[PDB]
């Protein structure tokens, strides 16, 4: 698990402190415990220093555990660094062999190559929609782009470092992404002591997006006689 420590985490297999992925395990006692102990499986007992995330270490050279040198194969203060697991079937649970699979993930940077078993919809344009291209979700209006993406490029971004164009995975054409429109709504009135009449301004909104209707520059104004 990420952020853990102990002779497996420290010397054998380290997960990064922000691991994205799943850890999966099952007892393997029938496959991996042998009648006299299964010495096919061993673990690193000693290191000079703890290994980095996803470092692997095949080293078999003798470890030194004191101030004095050990210029040779054996001693009192120096050791062979790998020790076997005594996996006997008479071992209690917790002392039995577990097979482990760590599925470790990388999200979008390039377009994805591994995805879940979903199916694509048809593509619609000039309408406000939700979308999901290769796991890149959003909501917006899709338009055929005139942006000159180079052949390797998948997505396009504005000055704000926000997506404003995309490549469809199925047909390699480029779509401009525009946010579905929003604005302040303000109510205009002569005040209740004069009348319950009101007019309404959709601020910065075009009247096609929304009984008198009037396109001011302040927004679409509704319920006022020009």
């Amino acid at each position, epitope marked *: 698990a990420p952020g853990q420590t102990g002779k497996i985490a420290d010397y054998n297999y380290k997960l990064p402190d922000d691991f994205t992925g799943c850890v999966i395990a099952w007892n393997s006692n*029938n*496959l991996d*415990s042998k009648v006299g102990g299964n010495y096919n499986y061993r673990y690193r007992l000693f290191r000079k220093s703890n290994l980095k995330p996803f470092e692997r270490d095949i080293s078999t050279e003798i470890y030194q555990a004191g101030s004095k040198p050990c210029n040779g194969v054996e001693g009192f203060n120096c050791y062979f660094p790998l020790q076997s697991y005594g996996f006997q*079937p008479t071992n209690g649970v917790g002392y039995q062999p577990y097979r482990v699979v760590v599925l470790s993930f990388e999200l979008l940077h390039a377009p994805a190559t591994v995805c879940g078993p979903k199916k694509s919809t048809n593509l619609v344009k000039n309408k406000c929609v939700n979308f999901n291209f290769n796991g890149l979700t959003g909501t917006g209006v899709l338009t055929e782009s005139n942006k000159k993406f180079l052949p390797f490029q998948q997505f396009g971004r504005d000055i704000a470092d926000t997506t404003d164009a995309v490549r469809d995975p199925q047909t390699l054409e480029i779509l401009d992404i525009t946010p579905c429109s929003f604005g302040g709504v303000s109510v205009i009135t002569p005040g209740t002591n004069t009348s319950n009449q009101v007019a309404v301004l959709y601020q910065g909104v075009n009247c096609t997006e929304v009984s008198n209707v009037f396109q001011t520059r302040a927004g679409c104004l509704i319920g006022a006689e020009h």
Partner: antibody
Amino acid sequence: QVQLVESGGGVVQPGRSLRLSCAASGFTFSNYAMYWVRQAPGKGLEWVAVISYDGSNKYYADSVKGRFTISRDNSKNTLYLQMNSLRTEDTAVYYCASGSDYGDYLLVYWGQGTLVTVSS
Amino acid sequence: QSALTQPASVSGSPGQSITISCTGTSSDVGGYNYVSWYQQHPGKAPKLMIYDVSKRPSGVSNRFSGSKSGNTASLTISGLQSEDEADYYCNSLTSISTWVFGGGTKLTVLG
């Protein structure tokens, strides 16, 4: 198909020695524990011995401990029982057997059985 | 090798469901989910029917099933047939790492 096939059983004198042999095929013999089990005429099964996959570890029933010796050839795929100081109560059908991925400690596959007759 | 206790025999009519009860100790049956059951037909070698208290090997009939409570372990055979007419041996590992068989039960089907 897995086979265990056995030889060396016969009539023998008390106090004598005899060697049983069990050839193995259709599985990776050297990956599994190998067993001897016996059955006196008209009686139940008695466990006799086991040997580890590599032969480094051996275990015996108290009825044969300090007398018998199990051994294996992982190049030939052959299991042996050396029987020494045979007693009339060693008179039985002897079966070799073996583990599998169901469990190394199971007697999953069995030989045809070979009869040993310790008689004066 | 202090044997597991078993009934000397059991019997039933075809199509009945019947049970064979093994018994051991905290060193063996009570110590491990390792109880194994061997069928043996007359004049031939044993075959494994149930292992790890209740698992079946491939090709064994789903008529055979197994259980454990405390120091006691059980085989059940549901819907008896003439092919069930055999000796059944319970077996266990032990914390001594010795294997122990039971006394053997003959199933006499009333055919």
